[PDB]
């Protein structure tokens, strides 16, 4: 019983950053070997845990939050960061534990792409994980842009450990 990472990383449709969706993964084998050894990833950064130890530790559950953003804002999906996305679309908690995975999706998402939206105007700051749907602007991703403008698909795997059986373990 392997965890449904394919439903997170091999999905055809991704949420926009202003309205990111998520999957809750539990009661399965979290074989992370599939992800950290993947040649599709441009970046992979973990907070509080080394990637090579992910298969040696258990969680109550994990949350896979996924969305598409422009490449030069990939650095904002981290604790302690600021910026329009960090502040008004996906607030990443400063005590975050988990891994952030991202890759270049230019060959899937760009168009010769008025689909993915992010916030421009938000009256106040978000608290961690508080997605809000209600102002918004299209990225308009193109096939002929630099890496900072090309779309990067992002998956954030947060790790939750509670007074629970801890059923999400690697091999």
């Amino acid at each position, epitope marked *: 019983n392997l965890c449904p990472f394919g439903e997170v990383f091999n999905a055809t449709r991704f949420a926009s950053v202003y309205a990111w969706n998520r999957k809750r993964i539990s009661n399965c084998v979290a074989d992370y070997s599939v992800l950290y050894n993947s040649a599709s990833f441009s*970046t992979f*950064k973990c907070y509080g*845990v*080394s990637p090579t130890k992910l298969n040696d530790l258990c969680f109550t559950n994990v949350y896979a939050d996924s969305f598409v953003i422009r490449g030069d804002e990939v650095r904002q999906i981290a604790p302690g960061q600021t910026g329009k996305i960090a502040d008004y679309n996906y607030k990443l908690p400063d005590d975050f534990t988990g891994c952030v995975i991202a890759w270049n999706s230019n060959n899937l998402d760009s168009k010769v792409n008025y689909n993915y939206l992010y916030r421009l105007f938000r009256k106040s700051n978000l608290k961690p994980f508080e997605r809000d749907i209600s102002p918004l602007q299209s990225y308009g991703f193109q096939p002929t842009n630099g*890496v*900072g403008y090309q779309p990067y698909r992002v998956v954030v795997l947060s790790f939750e450990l509670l007074h629970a059986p801890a059923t999400v373990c690697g091999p």
Partner: antibody
Amino acid sequence: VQLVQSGAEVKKPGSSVKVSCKASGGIFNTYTISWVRQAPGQGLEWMGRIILMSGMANYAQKIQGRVTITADKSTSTAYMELTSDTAVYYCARGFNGNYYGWGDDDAFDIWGQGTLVTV
Amino acid sequence: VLTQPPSVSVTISCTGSNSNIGAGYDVHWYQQLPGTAPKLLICGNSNRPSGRFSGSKSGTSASLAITGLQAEDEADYYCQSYDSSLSGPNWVFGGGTKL
């Protein structure tokens, strides 16, 4: 951590060279190896980086198609090889103090000795 | 390429663009003594490894501050940052300043 590179060598111009680099220190926090070169009297130029886990590597556009980098997990080495200058080629591990793994905002902290290749 | 003064007798400047420094990406600093590989002195905006130095960013520019004319640290200083243009990820080192 320690990164040991190859010694100096001379090749005929137009030929190929293979430069090894072995991360013998530990390899426990090394996820990626980058290569940077420095021509005599010049500054440093990034040439490429390989992620040891995935085997994927990115390259500077100016040398694309004539450079390859191979990660050999079994020996903890990264091979930098070129086809078809007299620059010094340095091996360095990527590192970031805020997170484990690799990314764009990381830095090259531990550098090898530098292998010169001349014609 | 990041622009730097050929030499400084103090502070070492580093000027880029909004595709690399004004982009928000971290600017790292190195000290290269002749005969060897460069040593990192600043990671991120202003963190440092064990073993006098500070720095900051402003707009599309960044700078390294070295205080005290100690010994003879006539090293070649370089700035490094991630460039988000071209047609793919690349890292850029500055021209290099002799101190």
